[PDB]
Design a protein around this ligand. Structure first.
Ligand SMILES: NC(=O)c1ccc[n+]([C@@H]2O[C@H](COP(=O)([O-])OP(=O)(O)OC[C@H]3O[C@@H](n4cnc5c(N)ncnc54)[C@H](OP(=O)(O)O)[C@@H]3O)[C@@H](O)[C@H]2O)c1
Ligand SMILES: Cc1cn([C@H]2C[C@H](O)[C@@H](COP(=O)(O)OP(=O)(O)Oc3ccccc3)O2)c(=O)[nH]c1=O
Ligand SMILES: [Cl-]
Ligand SMILES: [Cl-]
Ligand code: NA
Length: 325
C-alpha cells in the first residue's frame, strides 16, 4: 500500500514541484489537500486527486492520511508540524524546517517520542550532481579545498508574496539564504562557525531582502554565501582549491530534464563535464516515502537539519543589520 499523503496549504511549491512528484510516485497516494479556502483546495484536487478539505485541522483528523506535507510559510511551520506529529502523522516539512534551533529540537523530540519521521525537504540534497562533484573534489581534481562560495539570488517577487512578511514567510535569509548555508554544510562539513554577515532590511516592509555571510571551518576553509530577492537570478557554487577551481550553475533547482555542467579550471587547462539529468523533487519524495514505509529514519537527516538551524540562527544573530534607505 502506498503511504497516504495529505497536504496542508495549497502552496505554489506544492502546485509546481511537490504535488506532481507525489502524483507520479508509486509509493505515495495524495489522499487529501487542505486550504484556508475550500475553492483553492478543490482547484488543487481537481488537478492532483484527493479530497479537498477546508482548514488544516480537518485534514489532520483523517484516518486515511499517514503523512502530511507542510509547504506553509516558514514562520508557521512549527505550529502545524507539532500538530501533525501529535495527530500521529509523519511529516515532510518544507525548508527551512523552522525558524530556530530550539524550535527544531522540540519538533524532533515530539516526533521521536512517537516514532514518527520529520524530514526537512531540501530536495536538492537528493540530486546526484552534488555527490558527483564531491567525488571529483575527493579525487584531487583541484587539490586541497581552500574556500567555497555559493549564491542563490532572485528578482523581486510580486508584492504580497509571503517572503515580504516577516511573521509569515520570514524574509530572504529564512527562505532563500538557507540554500547556500545548507550547501556549505554539505560540502565543508559539520564544524562550520559563523564569522560575519550583513543583512539588508527594507524599512518599508520591514523584511530582510538580501545578505552575505562569511563562515569558516576550524581549519580556515571559508564559505562566502550570498542570497537575496532584490537581484538578478543567480544559483551557483564554486570551490577554490590549491591547484584549480570548480564551479557550476543551476545548483539548487535544476530542472528534472536539465543536464548539469561541471566547470573546472586549472593552470593552462579548463574542462567541462556534462552530467546526467535527474528529477530531484521526485527523488526527495521517494526517499521520504521509503523511510516512512521501511521505518528507517536516517539519523543524519535530523542531525543535519539541527546543525543547519544553528548556523542560520548564528547568521541571524551575528549579522550586521542595515536598514535602507
Ligand atoms: N524546497 C524548495 O525548493 C522550495 C521552493 C519554493 C518554496 N519553498 C518553501 O515552501 C514554503 C511555501 O513557499 P511557497 O513559495 O510555495 O509560498 P506560497 O505559494 O505562499 O504558499 C504558502 C501556502 O501556505 C498557506 N498559508 C497559510 N497561512 C498563510 C498566510 N498567512 N499567508 C500565506 N500563505 C499562508 C497558503 O495555502 P492556503 O491558502 O491554501 O491555506 C499558501 O498557499 C516555504 O517554507 C518555502 O520556503 C520551498
Ligand atoms: C530559472 C529562473 C528563475 N527565476 C526566478 C523565478 C523564481 O521566482 C525564482 C526561483 O526560481 P527557481 O530557481 O526555478 O526555484 P523554485 O521556484 O523552484 O523555488 C524557489 C522559489 C523562490 C526562491 C528560491 C527557490 O527565480 C529567474 O528570475 N530567472 C531564471 O532563470
Ligand atoms: Cl530543495
Ligand atoms: Cl553553464
Ligand atoms: Na543581528
Amino acid at each position: 500500500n502506498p503511504i497516504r499523503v495529505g497536504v496542508i496549504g495549497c502552496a505554489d511549491i506544492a502546485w509546481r514541484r511537490a504535488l506532481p512528484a507525489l502524483e507520479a510516485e508509486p509509493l505515495t497516494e495524495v489522499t487529501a489537500i487542505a486550504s484556508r479556502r475550500w475553492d483553492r483546495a478543490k482547484r488543487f484536487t481537481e488537478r492532483f486527486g484527493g479530497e479537498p478539505v477546508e482548514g488544516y485541522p480537518a485534514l489532520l483528523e483523517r484516518d486515511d492520511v499517514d503523512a502530511v506535507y507542510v509547504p506553509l510559510p516558514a514562520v508557521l511551520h512549527a505550529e502545524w508540524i507539532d500538530r501533525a506529529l501529535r495527530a500521529g502523522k509523519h511529516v515532510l516539512a518544507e525548508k527551512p524546517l523552522t525558524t530556530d534551533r530550539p524550535q527544531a529540537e522540540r519538533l524532533f523530540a515530539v516526533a521521536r517520542e512517537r516514532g514518527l519521521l520529520l524530514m526537512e525537504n531540501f530536495m536538492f540534497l537528493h540530486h546526484p550532481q552534488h555527490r558527483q562533484v564531491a567525488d571529483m573534489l575527493d579525487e584531487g581534481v583541484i587539490g586541497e579545498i581552500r574556500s567555497f562560495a555559493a549564491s542563490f539570488t532572485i528578482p523581486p517577487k510580486p508584492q504580497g508574496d509571503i517572503r515580504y512578511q516577516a511573521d509569515v514567510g520570514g524574509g530572504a535569509l529564512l527562505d532563500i539564504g538557507v540554500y547556500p548555508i545548507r550547501a556549505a554544510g554539505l560540502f565543508l562539513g559539520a564544524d562550520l562557525e559563523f564569522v560575519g554577515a550583513v543583512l539588508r532590511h527594507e524599512r518599508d516592509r520591514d523584511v530582510v531582502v538580501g545578505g552575505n555571510a562569511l563562515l569558516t571551518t576550524r581549519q580556515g576553509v571559508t564559505a562566502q554565501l550570498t542570497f537575496g530577492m532584490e537581484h538578478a537570478y543567480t544559483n551557483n557554487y564554486e570551490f577554490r582549491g590549491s591547484t584549480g577551481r570548480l564551479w557550476m550553475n543551476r545548483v539548487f533547482t535544476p530542472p528534472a530534464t536539465y543536464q548539469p555542467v561541471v566547470h573546472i579550471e586549472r593552470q593552462d587547462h579548463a574542462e567541462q563535464f556534462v552530467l546526467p539529468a535527474h528529477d530531484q523533487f521526485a527523488k526527495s519524495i521517494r526517499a521520504f516515502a521509503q523511510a516512512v514505509l521501511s521505518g528507517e529514519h536516517p539519523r543524519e537527516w535530523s542531525e543535519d537539519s539541527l546543525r543547519q538551524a544553528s548556523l542560520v540562527d548564528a547568521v541571524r544573530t551575528g549579522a550586521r543589520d542595515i536598514y535602507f534607505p
